[PDB]
Amino acid sequence: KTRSSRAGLQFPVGRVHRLLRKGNYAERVGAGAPVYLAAVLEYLTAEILELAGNAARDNKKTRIIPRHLQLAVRNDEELNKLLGRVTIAQ
Amino acid sequence: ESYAIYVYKVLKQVHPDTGISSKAMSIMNSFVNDVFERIAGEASRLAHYNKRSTITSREIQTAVRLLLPGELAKHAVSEGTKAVTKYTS
């Protein structure tokens, strides 16, 4: 089965490994390194989406929007410290 | 390409009863690409410092702990550890 299914994650371990090897961040890449990176990306995305859905249910809406993402990012102190220097369209 | 399909899967898993917008999906993809790039750059720096020719799980953990804040970094490290364990299992 696919390495994504093997690791049980949802992000594409294969695409992550290919992007790493293409950017040439290093001569090689281990087998656990890509799984770990995919897991970290999935956890971060899951946290962002959780906060965005929470903000959406607070605002009484059925679809997440950039407003909900912004509200989530500025309500979570850690995400703010993480994306302070980040800009978003509209 | 993009991680839109995977972001949608994670969204349906965390909140199976909600949606998202086109701009919201784009912002999520930009965030995913940016986090990937930051972690990859930090990992490349650490590998060049250690004079290694292969990025490893230890390098990725160090990069994560250097990038993300404290509690978030610890949770991400725990998730990655569980993931790599299930993978090697």
Binding site: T2, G14 | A4, I5, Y8, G19
Partner: peptide, 13 residues
Amino acid sequence: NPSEDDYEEEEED
């Protein structure tokens, strides 16, 4: 939204 064009699978090994 994940339409049929989005439900596509991956490629072979």
